[PDB]
Scaffold this active site. Structure first.
Site, short mmCIF file in Angstrom:
data_model
loop_
_atom_site.label_atom_id
_atom_site.label_comp_id
_atom_site.label_asym_id
_atom_site.label_seq_id
_atom_site.Cartn_x
_atom_site.Cartn_y
_atom_site.Cartn_z
N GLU A 41 83.73 1.79 -39.15
CA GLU A 41 84.88 0.99 -38.69
C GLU A 41 86.14 1.82 -38.38
OE1 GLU A 41 84.81 -2.16 -37.90
OE2 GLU A 41 83.09 -3.05 -38.90
N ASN B 19 90.54 -6.29 -29.94
CA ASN B 19 89.24 -6.91 -29.61
C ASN B 19 89.37 -7.55 -28.24
OD1 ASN B 19 89.52 -7.89 -32.98
ND2 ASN B 19 88.00 -6.38 -32.28
N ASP C 105 88.99 -10.54 -27.42
CA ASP C 105 89.63 -11.85 -27.53
C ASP C 105 91.12 -11.76 -27.75
OD1 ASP C 105 89.79 -11.19 -30.38
OD2 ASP C 105 89.53 -13.31 -30.88
N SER D 216 92.69 -10.32 -30.35
CA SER D 216 93.01 -10.00 -31.71
C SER D 216 92.90 -8.46 -31.88
CB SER D 216 92.12 -10.78 -32.69
OG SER D 216 90.77 -10.37 -32.60
N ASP E 236 92.15 -5.29 -34.91
CA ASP E 236 91.59 -4.92 -36.21
C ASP E 236 92.43 -3.82 -36.79
OD1 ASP E 236 89.14 -6.50 -35.61
OD2 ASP E 236 88.55 -4.80 -34.34
N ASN F 212 90.68 -8.14 -39.08
CA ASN F 212 91.22 -8.71 -37.85
C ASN F 212 92.28 -9.76 -38.05
OD1 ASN F 212 90.22 -11.58 -37.20
ND2 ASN F 212 88.33 -10.55 -37.75
N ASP G 17 82.97 -15.05 -47.85
CA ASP G 17 83.14 -16.16 -46.89
C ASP G 17 81.84 -16.89 -46.52
OD1 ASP G 17 81.87 -14.59 -44.85
OD2 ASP G 17 83.59 -14.48 -43.53
#
Length: 129
Positions: A35, A46, A48, A50, A52, A59, A101
């Site tokens: 990562e 990202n 979209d 967003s 990170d 994110n 989650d």
């Protein structure tokens, strides 16, 4: 800050990640490698829109607030810049929420694609823990 591999293993361990939700320490280190390359300052946008942030590439879409991700949540209740500190406490406790989650470490695309199914123990080999 760019952590050394064993240096990060040790910090991840003191913060309670080793076997957290059943993921051994090497999983967390492998995730961090692929990562961020162990770099606390790492940022990646990202598709979209967003971004990170941090050692674990957390994110702004769901977990932190960066002032610029429309219609996003901040389920960890923190600024995303806090995830860039050389002190990994915020990144680690936020990772505990994420991994709890329902999807486990599959939340982390790099973990799923580069760590999962592999000999993750190798990532802490030679570390004094």
């Amino acid at each position: 800050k760019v952590f050394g591999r064993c240096e990060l293993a040790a910090a991840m361990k003191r913060h309670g990640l080793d076997n957290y939700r059943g993921y051994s320490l090497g999983n967390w280190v492998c995730a961090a490698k692929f990562e961020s390359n162990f770099n606390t300052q790492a940022t990646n946008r990202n598709t979209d829109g967003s971004t990170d942030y941090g050692i674990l590439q957390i994110n702004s879409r769901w977990w932190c607030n960066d002032g610029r991700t429309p219609g996003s949540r901040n389920l960890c209740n923190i600024p995303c810049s806090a995830l860039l500190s050389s002190d990994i406490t915020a990144s680690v406790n936020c990772a505990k929420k994420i991994v709890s989650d329902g999807n486990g470490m599959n939340a982390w695309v790099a973990w799923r694609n580069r760590c999962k199914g592999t000999d993750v123990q190798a990532w802490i080999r030679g570390c004094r823990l």
